[PDB]
Ligand binder design. Sequence first.
Ligand SMILES: C[C@H]1Oc2cc(cnc2N)-c2c(nn(C)c2C#N)CN(C)C(=O)c2ccc(F)cc21
Ligand SMILES: C[C@H]1Oc2cc(cnc2N)-c2c(nn(C)c2C#N)CN(C)C(=O)c2ccc(F)cc21
Lengths: 288, 288
Amino acid sequence: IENLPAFPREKLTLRLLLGSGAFGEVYEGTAVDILGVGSGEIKVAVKTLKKGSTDQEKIEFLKEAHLMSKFNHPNILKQLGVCLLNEPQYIILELMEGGDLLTYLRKARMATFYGPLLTLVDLVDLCVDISKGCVYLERMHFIHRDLAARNCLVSVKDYTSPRIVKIGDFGLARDIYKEGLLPVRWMAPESLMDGIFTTQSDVWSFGILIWEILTLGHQPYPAHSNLDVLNYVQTGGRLEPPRNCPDDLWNLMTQCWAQEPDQRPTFHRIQDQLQLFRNFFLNSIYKS
Amino acid sequence: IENLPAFPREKLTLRLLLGSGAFGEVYEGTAVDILGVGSGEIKVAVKTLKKGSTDQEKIEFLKEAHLMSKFNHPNILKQLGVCLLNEPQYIILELMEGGDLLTYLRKARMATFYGPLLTLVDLVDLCVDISKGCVYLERMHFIHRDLAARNCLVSVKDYTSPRIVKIGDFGLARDIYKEGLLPVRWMAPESLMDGIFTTQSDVWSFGILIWEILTLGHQPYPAHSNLDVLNYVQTGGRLEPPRNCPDDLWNLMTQCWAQEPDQRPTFHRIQDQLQLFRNFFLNSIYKS
Ligand SMILES: C[C@H]1Oc2cc(cnc2N)-c2c(nn(C)c2C#N)CN(C)C(=O)c2ccc(F)cc21
Ligand SMILES: C[C@H]1Oc2cc(cnc2N)-c2c(nn(C)c2C#N)CN(C)C(=O)c2ccc(F)cc21
């Protein structure tokens, strides 16, 4: 019997507004003893469901909350509690003070032209993090269907402390134990043409994700309007390689965008390739 | 009664050779219970005094050991023990697995042209570290007289874990409570011309040090032979600013190389300026 973690609305204080997500509104706040009796006023994020909103939207809201209760993995955003008896509904998430990956990446590049505040090893660690999360989703028979940096989160705001990224928005995730959409730049050709979604289209999008990471948050297909994108892609056109991107990481990405879905790597292999490259590169610098 | 920390030569095992420093030989090894009874086989570095070497050199060796016993500060290399009853003499230092700052800087720049493995904030933290060490030496009435990246050490080999640099070679340090030399590129004009050394010539050299940090270990005055350097400097010539070096840090460096020794900043002000710039820059990125 699946149970969402009920949490006393009284012990929750909404302090900062972080943005307007969904329908829709997210706040930083504090929640007493979320982590237990020896917790304190630990900071949290709060996802809210607007009052009076569609009965259908409330269901999507509840769907999300259920997906996140089900998941338990270091690279998957934690849902710490819910407030569902009173409106507005609250989904209480662990606070990721670095905000969304995309923003965290772009601040890193734009902070000083002395150089990015994230290095190649930093970026490889981000990729390794998200890929573990993908391994996990696959093992749980879930397809995320919207893998992109805007949908991941970073645990710290600064660029010096140890950091972790997590997948953090499962509004489109689907169980696959057996008229909307938008993000054309992340979608596999099968998905755009035939409306088909699989773990292998997730692999296409992870390819785009790690491209986003390696460019520090550039827009895919910068010279193409949304409309031209599907032309471009459907052709056989692919993104340009990031400036000075390691050949190993380009070959991985490239294979993620195999036209033929069964010619793409698996998530396990993708994580292997990422860990393999990291060790190679670490070893490489020390022997210098 | 000044006492060097005597340590049982038996509990020491010389494993790796790290290089040949002084007269002269340094090893990585392990030393049982250096940190106390609950220590274990903790890794150390070992500075050795060659057998049969000059009676005078042994004195310089002993001088160093005494200087380092006297000092206790987070940014000054720890001397953990000595082996002075038997030859070869051993000075047992905490291991700084990043090696010397200069090498650590150059590996950072040469590891991938995707970008340096040290960012501006990393480098500013290095400068802040060494400047605290300089504040301390001054407060102890000591002049180091050879401040340079080759003479500092980094606590870790990788470029991700928290790191600290320390001043680590006091072969030339002098107490100032009241025919050798070489490093012309680090020496104040008074020092080269008149053989004069003060805390203010130390400030000149720290200027050069932080230049070394900000260029990731480039040689000062690259277009000048050692001979031409004193001409160049004695004129009024100064180093070029590092590529994309923050204006605040250029103004600091520049002032460290004031022709007139009393027109140079103090170490306290230098540390203030460094901490002030760091906060400004951190604040700067977040509000972006
Ligand atoms: C549901 C929401 O959750 C969080 C948001 C933040 C931190 N931690 C969590 N859990 C956050 C953001 N920006 N900033 C400055 C902070 C902070 N601190 C991003 N944001 C406004 C979002 O709406 C968003 C975006 C993507 C995603 F996957 C979840 C979320
Ligand atoms: C006296 C010596 O001490 C140490 C050396 C090292 C680490 N920790 C300590 N204490 C070290 C070095 N390289 N590498 C790879 C390691 C390691 N691990 C540098 N080196 C060979 C030096 O001789 C040297 C240079 C400058 C300085 F200030 C002290 C020293």
